[model samples]
Target: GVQPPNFSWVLPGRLAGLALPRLPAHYQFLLDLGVRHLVSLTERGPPHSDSCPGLTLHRLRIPDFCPPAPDQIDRFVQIVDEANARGEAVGVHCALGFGRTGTMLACYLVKERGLAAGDAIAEIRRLRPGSIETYEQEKAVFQFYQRTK
Candidate 1:
């Protein structure tokens, strides 16, 4: 048996670029994959390049911690929804593609797909093993869900 490729929560055409140190190669790869929009969810990082020439980058700065604020989720979902409305695929990623990014993505699924928080979290785990393991972050996302409803 062989391991399968990772399934991204982001649609095929839209990408969420995680905040990491300069990695031009990765950005190029994402562009090659038809990624049209980049969303960064970190509070600190090198300034993004304006010379990507064709790519569009949108940064939604949010702190990384337990119990993410509803405002943060609102900002994230707003960006995601905007991208989706443009008929573009969207990717949500953070450092290591876990923790904060995973939590945000879970929330997106719950809001967009009408999935319960527990079911959405389970689906994320099944897709990306160990992607989200922090109880505090998970709890925060669940709280956001409750508040939204």
Candidate 2:
């Protein structure tokens, strides 16, 4: 059996997390999913030049297997908030879309939505299995909570 690509909504219709999209066809899938703002949490840019015409790409690079910096956390929430304010869905992705992706999502939940760090982590894991992949990632969420709350 093939290991399926990771892709799912972390906050119902508001935000989604997925593996870094590398294929030409994936752009269409993004548009179909109603994602207008695509946030890349990876260190590298999108693999292709044609990354869909209408979608806005934001690069908030976090190292693979690591959590975002405090400032990056601020930007992440701002980006998502802006996108949601515009009534558009936002999608965030890392290399494999678990560690970095989940860390930032947890930050948003804790800081913006007022979920406890533990509950935020739990909710994200429930929504997307294998999220918040490391202790540091978990710590990042907690730190983000402490700083903002």
Candidate 3:
């Protein structure tokens, strides 16, 4: 079997067994490593308190298919900005830790890192292979970058 490559920031954080399991067991590791916020792209149900204890949780309610709306992007930007203002590390994740999560993160990089949309997408790919495979999601994020700038 092929091993997954290492990533600097886009680390895998899976929630097993449907309905987004109680934050998974590794959330403390993220907190210990300085992750201060946990953002979920899905709006399936309530958060698992056992997995995420003290960390602020923000949900954007992104759908499963297609791109997220502008309002969603605005909310995402707000959350990211808030986290940045608090000097806290943010961990954004979805079901597979791709698609919506990656798109939002890409937009954040473009807006915060002063990187172009394409550059941001490439950076995500470099960190997490096939991170932004959905064309709609990628284009939506790029458009958000352009629109916001």
Best by TM-score: 2
Can you write out model 3's per-residue Cα lDDT over 2-101, one digit (the tens) per residue? 1111213642331111123244445555566566676767757334535657667777677786677888888877876777677676677666666776
- Flag clash pairs in model 2: none
Worst 10 residues of 1 by lDDT: 1-10
Task: Give the clash count for each candidate.
Answer: 2, 0, 0
Off by over 4 Å in 3: 1-24, 45-47
TM-score of each: 0.79, 0.92, 0.79
Instruction: Please give the distance, in angstroms, between residue 119's alpha carbon in candidate 1 and its true position after superposition.
Output: 0.9
Distance (Å) between predicted and true CA of 109, model 1?
A: 0.6
RMSD of 3: 5.6
Candidate achieving the largest lDDT? 2
Cα deviation of 31 in candidate 1 (Å)? 2.1
The C-alpha lDDT values of all candidates are: 0.63, 0.84, 0.64
